[PDB]
Swiss-Prot record, chain A:
The chain holds residues 71 to 140 of 418 of the full protein. This is 26S proteasome regulatory subunit 6B. The lineage of its organism: Eukaryota, Metazoa, Chordata, Craniata, Vertebrata. It is found in: Cytoplasm; Nucleus. Component of the 26S proteasome, a multiprotein complex involved in the ATP-dependent degradation of ubiquitinated proteins. This complex plays a key role in the maintenance of protein homeostasis by removing misfolded or damaged proteins, which could impair cellular functions, and by removing proteins whose functions are no longer required. Therefore, the proteasome participates in numerous cellular processes, including cell cycle progression, apoptosis, or DNA damage repair. It comes from Homo sapiens (Human). Belongs to the AAA ATPase family. Component of the 19S proteasome regulatory particle complex. The 26S proteasome consists of a 20S core particle (CP) and two 19S regulatory subunits (RP). The regulatory particle is made of a lid composed of 9 subunits, a base containing 6 ATPases including PSMC4 and few additional components. Interacts with NR1I3. Interacts with PAAF1. Interacts with TRIM5. Interacts with ZFAND1. The gene is PSMC4.
Curated annotation (Swiss-Prot), chain E:
This is 26S proteasome non-ATPase regulatory subunit 7. Belongs to the peptidase M67A family. GO terms for cellular component: cytosol; extracellular exosome; extracellular region; ficolin-1-rich granule lumen; membrane; nucleoplasm; nucleus; proteasome complex. The keyword Repressor does not apply. The lineage of its organism: Eukaryota, Metazoa, Chordata, Craniata, Vertebrata. Does not bind a metal ion. Disulfide bonds: none annotated.
Curated annotation (Swiss-Prot), chain F:
Component of the 26S proteasome, a multiprotein complex involved in the ATP-dependent degradation of ubiquitinated proteins. This complex plays a key role in the maintenance of protein homeostasis by removing misfolded or damaged proteins, which could impair cellular functions, and by removing proteins whose functions are no longer required. Therefore, the proteasome participates in numerous cellular processes, including cell cycle progression, apoptosis, or DNA damage repair. PROSITE patterns: MPN. This is 26S proteasome non-ATPase regulatory subunit 14. It comes from Homo sapiens (Human). The keyword Phosphoprotein applies. The gene is PSMD14. InterPro entries: JAMM/MPN+_dom (IPR000555), JAMM_MPN+_peptidase_M67A (IPR050242), MPN (IPR037518), RPN11_C (IPR056263). Belongs to the peptidase M67A family. PSMD14 subfamily.
Curated annotation (Swiss-Prot), chain G:
Phosphorylated at Ser-65 by PINK1 during mitophagy. Phosphorylated ubiquitin specifically binds and activates parkin (PRKN), triggering mitophagy. Phosphorylation does not affect E1-mediated E2 charging of ubiquitin but affects discharging of E2 enzymes to form polyubiquitin chains. It also affects deubiquitination by deubiquitinase enzymes such as USP30. Changing R74K: No effect on ADP-ribosylation. The record marks R54, R72 as: Interacts with activating enzyme. It is found in: Cytoplasm; Nucleus; Mitochondrion outer membrane. This is Ubiquitin. Residues 1-76 form the Ubiquitin-like domain. It comes from Homo sapiens (Human). The modification Phosphoserine is found at S65. Changing S65D: Phosphomimetic mutant that binds and activates PRKN. The modification (Microbial infection) ADP-ribosylthreonine is found at T66. The record marks H68 as: Essential for function.
């Protein structure tokens, strides 16, 4: 059921996705990204993303409305 | 994980920099691009921590 | 009834803009039904690209209530 | 007949414009990274039948307004200042009208007219033909008049620049014309560039003067790049004219 | 040659509904329909299907019906709604193929030059891979057959597409499954493997007991082509093959011996990290 | 005359016809009819789904000639049986699966002809390989906006399957229509073959992959597993007394002991065991 | 005279008309029994589209013939 | 105006290749098909016509359709070559007309036999009582040569419509070379 639970999260991408860049991380599962819309946010991240991919200031995807790390 | 799908359909938060605070539990913050705002503090934070 | 309907959807407040250039796209080879759209390749005439006053470029295949001959870039 | 015009306008009303953007790269078979011209970047998809091989890094597409997906790949922009100097010259009597300098009339013919009409003789000796020339002299000797008779032959493939309306009020945006010019000169293959009176944009050098001079010199060095630089040129000829050649940059 | 076909999972289900349409007769009524696919490559694709009326008797299997007029109009509709798609062949639902099944192919080779059948099975009593497909050639024999015409086995597999994997595997939630389980599928795979081995041997001796004694044509088919099967039969435990298991299995034993030697140390980290966290949260609480 | 707790039965062929027509016509609304039977006054059952030739825009979609319509149903009667239209469907690509202002305009057209005409919404974009976002709605009058519309004699269509989503009640629920529940009926015959379509023959169960690459893969994986052990000695010994949520913030980055170390052992286990055990059976069984 | 309007919902609608009547008057009568406006109505007689500018005698539609009623289907 | 489904059984065996009718039997039996399709059209457009042959294969060139222009395309290059085959020729018309679209239409079969049949009387009486069990009326028109002064045919028609039947008839041949309109002078209505 936990592996069925991981797959059902994945509707959140669905490709109308916008692109930001990763900046910093505060604590467990909460970080800061710099969007390509000019401004700067304080977002939440999914438990799915492997944490080895972080800090090159990586290119990241973001939600449109709710603006989280996806 | 099952609860999580609603919580990330929820709006984010801005980040800004405190210039300096003033009286009556307010500060003065330029955000990133825009002007400076006189805003409210939370109930969990203190004025002296700013 | 139509000239009444033209009056309604042609209001006064407008956004002005610039005609950047003009084009003419051809049709394609295959258009299967079910997913058939007239916008894709059912028009072979003229077409234009427009930048607004808000620094935003737009593509429109249907020109509007003007003539493509009278338009220059 | 007037009813037919109204029915065309009934069809015309429900058309919705489309977003213009450029393809950055291909992520997967159905995921694409594009960028709107005004700003931010997106992750998109095509429809089904768009012939996705033609989508390359650097091409231009049209996007849906709401679904925000790729509709059609399109050719390259033109920046209609170029259209204001491409199809703008009116015709002229040919060089039988001019006279008294038939040496220089012949001399221009080998650098422009011959190596595109007859490229074989240059390959036989084995020497690349020259690229650009320079006209100079007192005013009223007919420097502008000579270029009109050359332009009156082609009348389709001739770019004329005043070399003074290039400047602007912004910081970039004067180089951005020059990149668009040579790229338009890249697309059509046998192009002719004509810039009268370089002395506005030309100059020589200043020992760290006004920042406004630095805008001119950075604009000047885009020419010194894109005449020699990395990318070589083919069939691109540049006619240059001025009154005083002493004030010019020796690198030019 | 075609050398495999690719069957999307929208069909194998758009056949069984048509078996469920006329299935109220219960006893026997074979479903025959029209198959739709892609003129792709040497490899071929299968996308869509539809039905066609068909009936046939029990004796004198030469009385059968394919409405050409129904086949012209309804394919003319599917050509109208879909220009990408054209015909590739046909199917029937019969568990074992019948004697009638060659003249049906000989009809519709005038539609596609290589018209291919697909046999499906609504009831796979075999728990193995169903829905196998054939193609007809000519193999004129030493006996003097004017045209030795019999179908040839072609391998096949179930296709996949991004939209249909969504809809199918949503419907798999009515039962439980371990696709994520490593080595739990694997142990079943040799169980599902050797069950297939025993099933083919019980079938072949039933053919072999009949042709030995009393009644069957003893013909110069399988009886020596199956003799070649006995010719291979490797002699496994002999002179130098012993030095293939004692030089190569003990290679793979060391890697397992390495992997256990770390897995025990990894689980030993979780002891001390828990035993520190146990008593030191206790001794500060008290 | 009153409503109830209604229930939308399906066919398994229908949902695959729903999304594949929806996915292939993704950037616009694609339309189709829905074909079934009114089994009682309480539940509804669709068994068939077909589309029609269409013509669309970016904002609207239209059908074309109705001579396709009656001739389609005619040739579905003579092959199989006759049946009944029950409603229709279309897509809302990437939207909040909600009846639009034109989508509602074709419903007083349909509810006046037959009573319980169901509008069905599908989205092949918010649907992942785990689960599908299917949706079906039922128009209600505005003249009975004060009077009750359902008698509510059970709990099955009140608190089950969700409370209505915030992006769908912003247009709809419970104004101008009401939602309806959807389940999945399954005949035994297709249920048995929907179970087994990911298995192979005994050829796949009895392979021995190849011993050159299998030793090469073991030579590969152990080699970086040495390097993972090099990094593992440093970090476990290190342990700055940092109250380990601060250990849990300095590890997002490039840091990865203890995570690949469990991983590659699992790969080296399941590869070597099956490669041995299948080679065991090919001697015991064969000759 | 009587006619028959057969829907795709298996429903038969009978209408008392005249052979000289226009099609839009028949579509008005369908609106009189249903409330469906005539722009949302399509009429098929023997695989043929019917036009409001003609009459029933133009298509040789006579007493107790069978029509086919298809509704407008635009969403969006 | 009445509701039926015309199933015509043409003859392209070899015995049609002679001239005991005036041009050739082929044009003689084609003109018989010309007058019956106009008969079924002017009766009722709801009626429909399908054809079958009695050759080595019993070929459905047209499945049952109300349009007759397709049938007239099939009658050209009919190739009158082959063996007459009878016991499966009714059987392929038997199971064909249970796949009709209008079940109010009566299953009526007409047959054109212009070749000698080698049938047994036992094989046809099995077919005759088979047609009793499904209530099919067949009117056979005889051409040319066959078992002359027809035996096992009048016996077949009578054992088709026995026990208060007489909806099925047997129009024998007029043994004379003449136009096909004189052949259909009595069957212009029925047998
Ligand atoms: N060689 C010549 N023959 C005839 N007319 C000439 C000649 N040279 C100059 N002119 C006259 O000069 C005018 C153009 O001069 P222009 O080309 O502008 O000189 P410059 O380019 O040096 O300023 C023409 O109108 C023409 O009448
Ligand atoms: Zn909509």
């Amino acid at each position: 059921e936990f592996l069925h639970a991981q797959e059902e999260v994945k509707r959140i991408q669905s490709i109308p996705l916008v692109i930001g860049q990763f900046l910093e991380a505060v604590d467990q599962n909460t970080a800061i990204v710099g969007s390509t819309t000019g401004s700067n946010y304080y977002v939440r991240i999914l438990s799915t993303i492997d944490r080895e991919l972080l800090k090159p200031n990586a290119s990241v995807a973001l939600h449109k409305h709710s603006n989280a790390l996806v | 994980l099952r609860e999580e799908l609603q919580l990330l359909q929820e709006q984010g938060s801005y980040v800004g920099e405190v210039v300096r605070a003033m009286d009556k539990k307010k500060v003065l913050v330029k955000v990133h691009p825009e002007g400076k705002f006189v805003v409210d503090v939370d109930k969990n934070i203190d004025i002296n921590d700013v | 009834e139509n000239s009444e309907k033209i009056k309604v959807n042609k209001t006064l407040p407008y956004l002005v803009s610039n005609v950047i250039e003009l084009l003419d796209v051809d049709p394609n080879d295959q258009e299967e039904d079910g997913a058939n759209i007239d916008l894709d390749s059912q028009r072979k005439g003229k077409c234009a690209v427009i930048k607004t006053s808000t620094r935003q470029t737009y593509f429109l295949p249907v020109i509007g209530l003007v003539d493509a001959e009278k338009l220059k870039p | 007949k007037q009813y037919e015009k109204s029915e065309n306008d009934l069809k015309a009303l429900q058309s919705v414009g489309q977003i213009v953007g450029e393809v950055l790269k291909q992520l997967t078979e159905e995921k694409f990274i594009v960028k709107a011209t005004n700003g931010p970047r997106y992750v998109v998809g095509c429809r089904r039948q768009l012939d996705k091989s033609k989508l390359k890094p650097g091409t231009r597409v049209a996007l849906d307004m709401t679904t925000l997906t790729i509709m059609r790949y399109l050719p390259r922009e033109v920046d209609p200042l170029v259209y204001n100097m491409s199809h703008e010259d009116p015709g002229n009597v040919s060089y039988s009208e001019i006279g008294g300098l038939s040496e220089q009339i012949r001399e221009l013919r080998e650098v422009i007219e011959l190596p595109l009409t007859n490229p074989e003789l240059f390959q036989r000796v084995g020497i690349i033909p020259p690229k650009g020339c320079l006209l100079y002299g007192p005013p009223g000797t007919g420097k502008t008049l000579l270029a009109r008779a050359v332009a009156s032959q082609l009348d389709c493939n001739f770019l004329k620049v005043v070399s003074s309306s290039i400047v602007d009020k912004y910081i970039g945006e004067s180089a951005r014309l020059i990149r668009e010019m040579f790229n338009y000169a890249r697309d059509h293959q046998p192009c002719i560039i004509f810039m009268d009176e370089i002395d506005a944009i030309g100059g020589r050098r200043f020992s760290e003067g006004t920042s406004a001079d630095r805008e001119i010199q950075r604009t000047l060095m885009e020419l010194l790049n894109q005449m020699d630089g990395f990318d070589t040129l083919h069939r691109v000829k540049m006619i240059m004219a001025t009154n005083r050649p002493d004030t010019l940059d020796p690198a030019l | 040659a075609v050398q495999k076909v690719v069957v999307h999972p929208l069909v194998l289900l758009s056949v069984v509904d048509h078996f469920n349409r006329i299935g109220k007769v219960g006893n026997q009524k074979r479903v025959v329909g029209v198959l739709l696919g892609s003129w792709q490559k040497k490899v071929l694709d299968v996308s869509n299907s539809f039905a066609v009326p068909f009936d046939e008797d029990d004796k004198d299997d030469s009385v059968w019906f394919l409405d050409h007029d129904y086949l012209e109009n309804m394919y003319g509709m599917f050509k109208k709604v879909n220009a990408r798609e054209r015909i590739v062949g046909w199917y029937h639902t019969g568990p074992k193929l019948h004697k009638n099944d060659i003249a049906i192919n000989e009809l519709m080779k005038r539609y596609c030059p290589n018209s291919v059948l697909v046999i499906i099975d609504v009831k796979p009593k075999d728990l193995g891979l169903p829905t196998e497909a054939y193609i007809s050639v000519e193999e004129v024999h030493d006996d003097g057959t004017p045209t030795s015409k019999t179908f040839e086995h072609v391998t096949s597999e179930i296709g996949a597409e991004e939209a249909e994997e969504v809809g199918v595997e949503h419907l798999l939630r009515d039962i439980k499954d371990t696709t994520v389980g490593t080595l739990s599928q694997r142990i079943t795979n040799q169980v599902h493997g050797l069950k297939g081995l025993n099933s083919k041997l019980l079938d072949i001796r039933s053919y072999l007991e009949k042709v030995a004694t009393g009644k069957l044509p003893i013909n110069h088919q399988i009886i020596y082509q199956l003799q070649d099967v006995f010719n291979l039969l490797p002699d496994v435990s002999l002179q130098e093959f012993v030095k293939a298991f004692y030089l190569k299995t003990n290679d793979q034993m060391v890697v397992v011996y390495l992997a256990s030697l770390i897995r025990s140390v990894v689980a030993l980290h979780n002891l001390i990290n828990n035993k520190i966290a146990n008593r030191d949260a206790e001794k500060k609480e008290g | 005359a009153v409503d109830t707790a209604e229930q939308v039965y399906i066919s398994s062929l229908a949902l695959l016809k729903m999304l594949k027509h929806g996915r292939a016509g993704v950037p616009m609304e694609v339309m189709g009819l829905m074909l079934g039977e009114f089994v009682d006054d309480y539940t509804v059952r669709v068994i068939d789904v077909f589309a029609m030739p269409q013509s669309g825009t970016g904002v609207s979609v239209e059908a074309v000639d109705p001579v396709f319509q009656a001739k389609m149903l005619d040739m579905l009667k003579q092959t199989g049986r006759p049946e009944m239209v029950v409603g229709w469907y279309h897509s809302h690509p990437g939207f909040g699966c909600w009846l639009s202002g034109v989508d509602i305009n074709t419903q007083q057209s349909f509810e006046a002809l037959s009573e319980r005409a169901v509008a069905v919404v599908v989205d092949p974009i918010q649907s992942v390989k785990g689960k599908v976002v299917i949706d079906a709605f039922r128009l209600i009058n505005a003249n009975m906006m004060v009077l009750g519309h359902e008698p509510r004699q059970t709990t099955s269509n009140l608190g089950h399957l969700n409370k209505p989503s915030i992006q769908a009640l912003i247009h709809g629920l419970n104004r101008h229509y009401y939602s309806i529940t959807i389940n999945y009926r399954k005949n035994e015959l297709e249920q048995k073959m929907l179970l087994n379509l990911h298995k192979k023959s005994w050829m796949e169960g009895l392979t021995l992959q190849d011993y050159s690459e299998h030793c090469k893969h073991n030579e590969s994986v152990v080699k970086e597993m040495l390097e993972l052990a090099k990094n593992y000695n440093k970090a476990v010994e290190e342990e700055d007394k940092m109250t380990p949520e601060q250990l849990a913030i300095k590890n997002v980055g490039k840091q990865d002991p203890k995570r690949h170390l469990e991983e590659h052992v699992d790969v080296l286990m399941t590869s070597n065991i099956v490669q041995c055990l299948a080679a065991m059976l090919d001697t015991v069984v064969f000759k | 005279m009587q006619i028959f309007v057969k829907t795709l919902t298996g429903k038969t609608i009978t209408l008392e008309v005249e052979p000289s009547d226009t099609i839009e008057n028949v579509k008005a009568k369908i609106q009189d029994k249903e409330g469906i406006p005539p722009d949302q109505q399509r009429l098929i007689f023997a695989g043929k589209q019917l036009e409001d500018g003609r009459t029933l005698s133009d298509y040789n539609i006579q007493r107790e013939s069978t029509l086919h009623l298809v509704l407008r289907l635009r969403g969006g | 105006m009445v509701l039926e489904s015309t199933m015509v059984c043409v003859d392209n065996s070899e015995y049609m290749r002679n001239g005991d009718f005036l041009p050739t039997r082929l044009q003689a039996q084609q003109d018989a098909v010309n007058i019956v399709c106009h008969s079924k059209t002017r009766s009722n457009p709801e009626n429909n016509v399908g054809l079958i042959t009695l050759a080595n294969d019993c070929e459905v060139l047209t499945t049952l359709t109300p349009d007759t222009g397709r049938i007239l395309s099939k009658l050209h290059t009919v190739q009158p070559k082959g063996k007459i085959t009878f016991c499966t020729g009714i059987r392929v018309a038997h199971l064909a007309l249970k796949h009709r679209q209008g079940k109010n239409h009566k299953m009526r079969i007409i047959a054109f036999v212009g070749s000698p049949v080698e049938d047994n009387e036992k094989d046809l009486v099995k077919l005759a009582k088979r047609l009793k069990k499904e209530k099919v009326n067949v009117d056979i028109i005889n051409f040319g040569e066959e078992e002359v002064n027809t035996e096992k045919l009048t016996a077949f028609v009578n054992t088709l419509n026995g026990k208060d039947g007489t909806g099925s008839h047997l129009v024998t041949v007029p043994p004379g070379p003449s136009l096909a309109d004189a052949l259909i002078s009595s069957p212009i209505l029925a047998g």
